[PDB]
């Protein structure tokens, strides 16, 4: 039943089609008469289900394209390891993690740009990196440049293998549709094989390499004097000195005397007082426990031996009296539509990136990460953005599913059909919740700005006036503080010092400490609730009305991506599902901008800073969040104005690139408004006059110049808006935190 079936030598390896731009499309293969064709070529290149009607041929392109993506990721990773090996102060940084700034990019001396080679320490000049690679490599037990070089070479070999495999599984051995539709098998393998064995094999690295290398580093042994990882594997006495359980070997594992591994596998919680990172014995044990969970989980689904669940039977069984046919059809939906799967998978991967952002700052997993404030701020912010983009993508592919792949026959009185049948109730209620949240969240800031401006501080929503205590969040912090020895009896310390208990310092710098929630924190949380509900409104409205509305009863026929259905019916600009995604991007940008600003200011005000010999905490912005973050004026003045000081004063320093990129990003953002605020009708008419001048001088091109399509105008607009807006914050953040952190 679960079988490998491929077609052999299915596509000849020829440059013929490389010399035929737009070969993949019947509409484009004929070549350009206008410049619109050039844009269309790029816009359509990866829209595989538009090229062919064959689900098999789409599936095979996807599988092969995926290998292309992994090949590129391997080149990028390889690059990061090679730059570490060749152009970094990593080895020097290992000997002084608190004093030396990580640097793995050196610029060439040309037109004076060598100013960007900063005095980072460790006997090089270069750009200070915020990716946290050094903290990752230190956690992995890498102590020398040979180990980084060999990883970089290994990366290039994996990139090569991914390219071969992509080529091979498209041109030589292309799996049939029935191969791809093995969702039960795929999930067993991905759960037990990818995640389970990934976590098991990584736990292996941690126990055998990371643990011994980091224990000796944390004791203060010179990284050159540390035995190479293989010596811990070869000489068991070496390992037994560090972790005595290694005397008893594997006998305690097979005999279920697992308490013998209490040294290597712990439940300490909290952080190393040395590194300000999670105890690697906690992480090794986490990865062992997760590995088992995943290997067990990947035995759920029926393959070739009778045992296991039919996902079809599971879905169809989950039927109640309020939800019609329940999950009937969804197995067919998810085995016949790539877009349906991409919708779910982007929602979860995006949501995961956001969970990772929160978990990694609060439970700093890498040694010397917590007190590398540039890295902490960068990693949180980065993973927030990746998460946001993925969630908006989920909206796009959910809507593409609704237009292209949805059938009423498959979705007959199932949860999907029933949702469409009360889309008016869903969207009216969510609309209401957005107005309720917006008025009662943003309104509190405006109330406060007004009362403060009128000299009425006693009339404000604040810790010192009308208090809005986040009592439920405060109560949960208390429970998590009281957990160790109580509801987590074997846990020695809290999961996170963010919840309560001690201030962890590395040198003088604060790694983590209790993040106290007051009126300012209550207010910004309701802004986040607000910005997320609106983004959901836009994207969900896009999905539920993708196929039709009362305005456009045949919207599915017009497609996913179309500018409008003309100025009639009062005007139908931006009715398409694509246009909902377009609007969703701005709100995602709005939502996440406020999240990373909340993060930056709260951490600087209330968490990050120095602890003196006396033991008094001095925060970077000295606790100004509680009284400043309850007005918009406080955000403008005490956050943007005050913290922009570093980026705008960066000229003539090693941070001058951030100053330039700050202005460059503002430029690109502003430039975006030209596309967003205008319409192609103006531009096509302007081009007519310019074309006249070229005709006059007999220099008009045969490929007729066209204004961008209405949709491309919007695509260009939002792309420059996001690039400009995000890159501005990037330059602001990095200049700020590299200076003050």
């Amino acid at each position: 039943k679960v079988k490998v079936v491929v077609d052999r030598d299915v596509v000849a390896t020829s440059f013929e089609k490389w010399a035929k731009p737009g070969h993949f499309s019947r509409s484009l293969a004929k070549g350009p008469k206008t410049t619109t064709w050039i844009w269309n070529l790029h816009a359509d290149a990866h829209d595989f289900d538009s090229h062919t009607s064959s689900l098999e041929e789409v599936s095979r392109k996807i599988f092969s394209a995926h290998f292309g993506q992994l090949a590129i990721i391997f080149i990028w990773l390889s690059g990061m390891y090679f730059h570490g090996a060749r152009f970094s102060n990593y080895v020097a940084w290992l000997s002084n993690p608190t004093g030396i700034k990580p640097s793995a990019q050196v610029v060439w001396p040309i037109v004076g740009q060598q100013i960007l080679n900063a005095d980072v320490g460790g006997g090089i000049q270069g750009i200070q990196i915020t990716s946290g690679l050094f903290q990752l490599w230190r956690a992995s037990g890498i102590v020398n440049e040979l180990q980084l070089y060999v990883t970089a070479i290994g990366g290039l070999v994996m990139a090569g293998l991914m390219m071969f495999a992509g080529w091979f599984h498209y041109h030589k051995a292309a799996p049939k549709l029935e191969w791809f539709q093995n969702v039960e098998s795929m999930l067993n393998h991905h759960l037990a094989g990818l995640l389970g064995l990934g976590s098991l094999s990584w736990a292996g690295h941690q126990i055998h390499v990371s643990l011994p290398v980091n224990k000796l580093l944390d004791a203060g042994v010179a990284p050159s004097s540390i035995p190479l990882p293989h010596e811990f594997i070869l000489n068991r006495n070496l390992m037994a000195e560090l972790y005595p359980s290694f005397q008893q070997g594997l006998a305690p594992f097979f005999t279920l005397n697992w308490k013998q591994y209490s040294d290597i596998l712990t439940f300490k919680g909290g952080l190393s007082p040395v590194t300000g990172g999670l105890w690697l014995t906690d992480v090794a044990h986490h990865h062992l426990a997760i590995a088992v969970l995943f290997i067990v989980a990947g035995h759920m689904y029926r393959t070739n031996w009778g045992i296991g669940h039919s996902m079809k039977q599971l879905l169809e069984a989950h039927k109640g009296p309020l939800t019609g046919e329940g999950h009937k059809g969804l197995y067919e939906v998810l085995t016949t539509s790539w877009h349906a799967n991409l919708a779910i998978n982007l929602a979860m991967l995006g949501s995961l990136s956001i969970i990772v952002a929160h978990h990694m700052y609060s439970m700093p997993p890498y040694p010397y990460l917590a007190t590398d404030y540039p890295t902490q701020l960068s990693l949180f912010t980065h993973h927030m953005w990746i998460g946001g983009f993925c969630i908006v993508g989920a909206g796009a592919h959910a809507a593409i599913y609704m237009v292209r792949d949805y059938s009423p026959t498959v979705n007959y009185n199932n949860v999907l059909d029933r949702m469409i049948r009360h889309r008016d109730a869903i969207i009216s209620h969510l609309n209401w919740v957005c107005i309720f949240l917006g008025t009662h969240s943003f309104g509190l800031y405006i109330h406060n700005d007004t009362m403060r401006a009128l000299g009425r501080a006693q009339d404000m929503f604040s810790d010192t006036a009308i208090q809005l205590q986040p009592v439920l969040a405060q109560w949960i912090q208390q429970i998590h503080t009281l957990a160790p020895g109580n509801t987590a009896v074997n846990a020695l310390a809290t999961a996170s010092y963010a919840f309560g208990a001690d201030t962890v310092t590395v040198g003088s710098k604060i790694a983590m400490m209790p993040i106290k929630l007051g009126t300012a924190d209550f207010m910004v949380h309701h802004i986040h609730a607000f910005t997320i509900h609106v983004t959901v409104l836009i994207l969900l409205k896009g999905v539920l009305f993708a196929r039709n509305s009362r305005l456009i009863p045949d919207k599915a026929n017009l497609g996913f991506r179309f500018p409008c259905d003309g100025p009639g019916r009062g005007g139908t600009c931006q009715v398409s599902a694509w246009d909902h995604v377009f609007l969703g991007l701005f709100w995602m940008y709005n939502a996440l901008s406020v999240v990373i600003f909340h993060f930056s200011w709260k951490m600087q005000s209330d968490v990050w800073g120095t602890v003196s010999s006396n033991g008094t905490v001095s925060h970077i912005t000295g606790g100004n969040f509680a009284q400043s973050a309850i007005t918009i004026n406080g955000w403008l003045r005490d956050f943007l104005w005050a913290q922009a000081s570093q980026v705008i004063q960066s000229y003539g320093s090693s941070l001058s690139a951030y100053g330039l990129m700050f202005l460059g990003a503002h430029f690109v953002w502003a430039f975006s408004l030209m596309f967003l605020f205008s319409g192609r009708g103006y531009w096509q008419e302007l081009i007519e006059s310019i074309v006249w001048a070229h005709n006059k001088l007999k220099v008009a091109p045969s490929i007729a110049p066209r204004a961008l399509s209405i949709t491309q105008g919007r695509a260009v607009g939002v792309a420059h808006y996001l690039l400009g807006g995000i890159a501005t914050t990037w330059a602001f953040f990095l200049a700020r935190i590299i200076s003050v952190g």
Binding site: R550, G568, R569
Partner: protein, 80 residues
């Protein structure tokens, strides 16, 4: 209501009539072109002004033209 006009360069291709989602238009006999038929706009009280007809018209310039006029429940496409 919107005004829909058909000019004499109509080649009777029927594409405007096929495109109209409100059944505003129909093909009528006519000796003026080889097709032996011309677009007609007898039901412009139902015209929403979407200009799908103009989009469909292959003649240069357009043989069918929609002049957006006074708005009505029907022309605004209102289901309330």
């Amino acid at each position: 209501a919107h005004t829909v006009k058909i000019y004499d360069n109509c080649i009777g291709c029927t594409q405007c009539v096929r495109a109209c989602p409100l059944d505003v238009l129909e093909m009528v006999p006519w000796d003026g072109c080889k097709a032996g038929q011309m677009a007609s706009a007898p039901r412009t009280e139902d015209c929403v002004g979407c200009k799908r007809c103009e989009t469909a018209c292959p003649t240069d310039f357009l043989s069918i033209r929609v002049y957006l006029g006074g708005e009505t429940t029907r022309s605004m496409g209102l289901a309330y």
